[PDB]
Amino acid sequence: MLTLIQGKKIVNHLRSRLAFEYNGQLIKILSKNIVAVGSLRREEKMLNDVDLLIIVPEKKLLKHVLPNIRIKGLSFSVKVCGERKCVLFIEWEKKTYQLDLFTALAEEKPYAIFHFTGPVSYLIRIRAALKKKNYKLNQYGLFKNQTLVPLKITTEKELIKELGFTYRIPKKRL
Amino acid sequence: MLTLIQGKKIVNHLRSRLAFEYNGQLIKILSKNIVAVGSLRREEKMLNDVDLLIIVPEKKLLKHVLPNIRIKGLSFSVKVCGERKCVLFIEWEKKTYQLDLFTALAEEKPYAIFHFTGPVSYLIRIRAALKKKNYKLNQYGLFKNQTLVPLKITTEKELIKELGFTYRIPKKRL
DNA sequence: TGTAACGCACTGCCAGCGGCTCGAAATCTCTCTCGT
């Protein structure tokens, strides 16, 4: 486990040294499209692991980003990897911790941000009330009978207000 | 062979005890989506066999319903079976009779109902005049030059009226 | 009229390139532990 600041100290070092491989074109990942999430964003004092989200602008990239990711200047290993989820072990300063990496689409940004902020308990209560209203909520979008519900929102905050719930900052979510 | 009422007495026993298997999930068949046809619906005195139509709501289900059909509390056999037609011999009251089972989609309902009601002669005479007008009639739909002709109808009666023919109740059809 | 389930010859067709067979290669679905 790592302290909150231990996780904080790591995040800033990464935003510059990011790239994924694709037809020889190693393409850097921009810090704007990067959002920190998980217990980290919840500002919990002690971190069980580290959780990061990625804003992917184009749909086809999915099958090439996470599978062919690259890391500058860090010893690491690969356990499991798909197009949406990727979990890697790392060697930061002689200790080993677990890291979680997820990708999301430009229209899923507020739906995704909200989901991965957590925690689980907070999310269940919302999905419970929506399941009691014939709705299905996930990190991608909102459904009714598997039919998308488009809302005139952009940020995670707008979504929660449009969902009709009391907005709460990460650490207030529980 | 069975009397008219003999088949009817059976039909009510079946509408409750019907199911088809699908990925271990045994799915019951609802009595609303069940319609009786053939010599039975025609109210003919003596029945050579029993004929039932089924309203399947979804297209993918076709290759799973009739092939994997199940009956509660009855020993039965299978003669021939596909996704559209299924013929079974049965043991009702120690005697052996033949049974016919057909499937149709929720949108094929009025076109299907008309077809399987019969009788043969009545159907041929109608379809003959339609063949003289570049039309093709079947249990599925209506065509002109192999292009489906959609009509603003729902029930078989509406279809017959839109076809422009004298409506006849089953026993009156001949 | 207008059609379905079937079994057969005839391919074509790839796991196989010669066979019409068994079960391969690859494209599936099911569950299971995971992830917030």
Numbering used by the authors:
A (entry chain B), B (entry chain A): 1 to 174
Which lines from the publication concern this structure?
Besides 10–23 DNAzyme, 8–17 DNAzyme can also efficiently catalyze the cleavage reaction of RNA substrate, forming the 5′-product with a 2′,3′-cyclic phosphate at the 3′-end and the 3′-product with a hydroxyl group at the 5′-end; similar structural features are also observed on the cleavage products of the naturally occurred hammerhead, hairpin, and hepatitis delta virus (HDV) ribozymes. Interestingly, the same catalytic motif of 8–17 DNAzyme has been independently isolated under different selection conditions and using different cation cofactors, indicating that this small DNAzyme is efficient and its catalytic core motif is ubiquitous in the sequence space. The Dz36/substrate complexes assemble into a “V” shape with two arms (P1 and P2) orientated ~70° with respect to each other in all the three structures.
Two types of non-cleavable 23-nt substrate analogs, including one native DNA and one DNA with 2′-OMe-G at the cleavage site, were utilized in the structural studies. To test whether O2′ could affect the local conformation of the catalytic core and to shed more light on the catalytic mechanism of the DNAzyme, 2′-OMe protection was introduced to the cleavage site (rG-1) of the DNAzyme(2′-OMe-G) structure. Unlike DNAzyme-Pb2+, the DNAzyme(2′-OMe-G) structure belongs to the P43212 space group. Owing to the different molecular packing, the relative orientations of AsfvPolXs are significantly different in the DNAzyme-Pb2+ and DNAzyme-(2′-OMe-G) structures; however, except the blunt-end base pairs that interact with AsfvPolXs, the central regions of the Dz36/substrate complexes are very similar in the two structures, indicated by the low rmsd value (0.586 Å) between them. Although the introduction of the 2′-OMe group did not cause an obvious change to the nucleobase and sugar pucker of G−1 in the DNAzyme-(2′-OMe-G) structure, it led to the shifting of both G13 nucleobase and G+1 phosphate group. When compared to the DNAzyme-Pb2+ structure, the distance (4.3 Å) between the N1 atom of G13 and the OP1 atom of G+1 is 1.5 Å longer in the DNAzyme-(2′-OMe-G) structure.
